[PDB]
Amino acid sequence: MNPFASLTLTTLTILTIPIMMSNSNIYKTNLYPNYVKTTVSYAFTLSLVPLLMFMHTGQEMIISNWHWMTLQTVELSLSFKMDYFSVMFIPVALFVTWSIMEFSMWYMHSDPFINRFFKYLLLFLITMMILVTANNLFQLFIGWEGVGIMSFLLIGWWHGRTDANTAALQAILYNRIGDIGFVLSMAWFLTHSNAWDLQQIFMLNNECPNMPLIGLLLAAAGKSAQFGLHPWLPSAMEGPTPVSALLHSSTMVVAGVFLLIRFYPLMETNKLVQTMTLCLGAITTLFTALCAITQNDIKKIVAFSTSSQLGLMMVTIGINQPHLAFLHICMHAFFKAMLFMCSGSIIHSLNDEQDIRKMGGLYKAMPFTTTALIIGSLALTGMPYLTGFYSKDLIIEAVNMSYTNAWALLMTLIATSLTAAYSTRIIFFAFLGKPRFPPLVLINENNPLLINSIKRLLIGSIFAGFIISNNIPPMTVPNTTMPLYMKMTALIVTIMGFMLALELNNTTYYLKFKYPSQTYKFSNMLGYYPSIMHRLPTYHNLSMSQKSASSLLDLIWLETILPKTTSFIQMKMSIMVSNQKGLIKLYFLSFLITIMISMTLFNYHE
């Protein structure tokens, strides 16, 4: 019965088995991480088959297997979309997760709660698969919030440390700001198209209005950490290195971009939202690449690089090239995860040191890590015929040859120069020169888990671009004719960035000292954006929620008007009524007054 559907469902289903076994006598032993890693590897191998079927015949499906509930005219069912995006993303994510889990078997060996860590990693993977394969907006929202919560739990892994808890709550806050737009899109689609599934939404919206697309763009900006809601991604480096390599670099943070790739038929018919997406991506990639070039923590540099590449993906979506953006997601996963793993290897070798100013000459002391990091940097910069070339080069050429905002084009070119600049910074400060680490040398990368994981990701970073490009049907029209200088624009700007960064880094060897400029201060302190935006709005909100909502209104005026006034009035009237001297003279005079009044007021009128 056409094994496509059965295999696609089984790939997702078998990932949940260790979750069900987490209460057995394997979660209490030291064999649980290997069990989870083997399950993930088997899932990847199984998922390779539907990909082959699609590459042969272009086979696609939707499976609506379970009917959850039905409203009056709206039916909600558990449905999975098994189109090109799902069947291409699942093997890539599974391969990266396999490599990162094998890496974590070595990186987190001293953690007393490593089994919970693997259980956590698998839960994130399951939620991400639910997000990716969803066919209706409710299932997609389930995956959305699931990966958000898993990221919150994994960022605050060391929960006795204040900064980790702060970073986790910050990620939640920014993602909730995006979730507002997600919910707006859901409500608009249900009240205007009477559906939450993709098929009816595509049928009933030939010219989509602004509001649902703007909601989707807000959700994507939240999830992919675009300029307005960017700062949470670099702060998410508070978690362990495997979490950074898996969730916050290659798989989860592309989800927002993936969302816009899902709704590309609607975005194709709206010029204003496309322009907004393009400008947002351009400013994001420029700002993050500009922040990255002065950072001293290696994880911060790689995180800002990830944010800049997400901005480039948003730019690609903005010029109406969604398939190129998806291809770039797939290409970027490999070398970004490898770069994070190499950084983690360096950190573990140098007694958990993350500052590049205390990493000296590791080119000879750490040969395999040096080779992997060099290959990853070359792939990230779009060096010809590597994995990053087959997406980034085409993206740059498509941006050049389109009717587009000129400022966005300029910022894209400047950002793709700054990419090579910060890659040069990492390589120069971490691997070249003389040692700057403490004298007790414990450098050792001779461990089969680390070597095998990095080697797998390295083979991917070398060959995946060619393999995937030559095996997909063409969904776009190629830019066959271009001026030679515009064909070489990406290579030229990369070379200029390389040379300028090398010169400015070589100047550091001189015996000259000068106080920094204001531009350097702007770059290093992240445009002062976290300094102002995490102090002024938070202070005003909390101060108002104490002074006005709690004290002025709830504790004073709401008390004053209804209950306190009633108590005061009743008490005063009680004092007035009950305080009589008990002298018959006074109230017998009162009786006389009452009798006369009753004889005149009521009795005279009959």
Binding site: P112, W158, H159, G160, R161, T162, D163, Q295, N296, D297, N351, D352, E353, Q354, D355, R357, K358, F429, G433, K434, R436, T508, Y509, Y510, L511, F513, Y515, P516, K521, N524, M525
Partner: protein, 178 residues
């Protein structure tokens, strides 16, 4: 962290703290070792140039100017040791720290494992119970009538005494507990 603070810092203490801070931030600026050594020697010469100033007012004015210059020229992202209050591993292992009194609540089946450890624990508890009253008496004797004026505590002075208020210092969990 271990020493009891004083009521105020002296001029020499402030000068030395500024010297250490300036050298650390200069090392943050001067990444390479030889360049840092050169500029650190220059900084030391600049510091000991005005070492023999007998006028205290001029000394404090110089210190004020030096602190203003430091605040202007500080590295916005100085190097921090990973376990220092600003480091990447500052409070990483605090979630693994468990106070010792929790061991009193273990089920007897859990205590059936580790018999010798719990016998030693009982010995330590007996020692603490026997020493407490003498510690309190020594603190009562040694304290001035208007209450203590510093946070410094006395040592043991008698034959088999223990330094007062020692239990929670001696039975610290660990730096790497689990």
């Amino acid at each position: 962290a271990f020493s009891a603070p004083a009521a105020y810092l002296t001029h020499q203490q402030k000068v030395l703290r500024l010297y250490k801070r300036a050298l650390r931030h200069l090392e943050s600026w001067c990444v390479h070792r030889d360049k840092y050594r050169y500029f650190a020697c220059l900084m030391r010469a600049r510091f000991d140039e005005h070492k023999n100033e007998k006028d205290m007012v001029k000394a404090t004015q110089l210190l004020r100017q030096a602190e203003e210059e430091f605040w202007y020229g500080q590295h916005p992202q100085p190097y921090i040791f990973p376990e220092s209050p600003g480091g990447t591993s500052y409070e990483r292992y605090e979630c693994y720290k468990v106070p010792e009194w929790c061991l009193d609540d273990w089920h007897p089946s859990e205590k059936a494992m580790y018999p010798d450890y719990f016998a030693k624990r009982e010995q330590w508890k007996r020692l603490r119970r026997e020493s407490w009253e003498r510690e309190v008496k020594q603190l009562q004797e040694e304290t001035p009538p208007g209450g203590p004026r510093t946070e410094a505590l006395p040592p043991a002075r008698k034959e088999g005494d223990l330094p007062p208020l020692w239990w929670h210092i001696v039975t610290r969990p660990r730096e790497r507990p689990m």
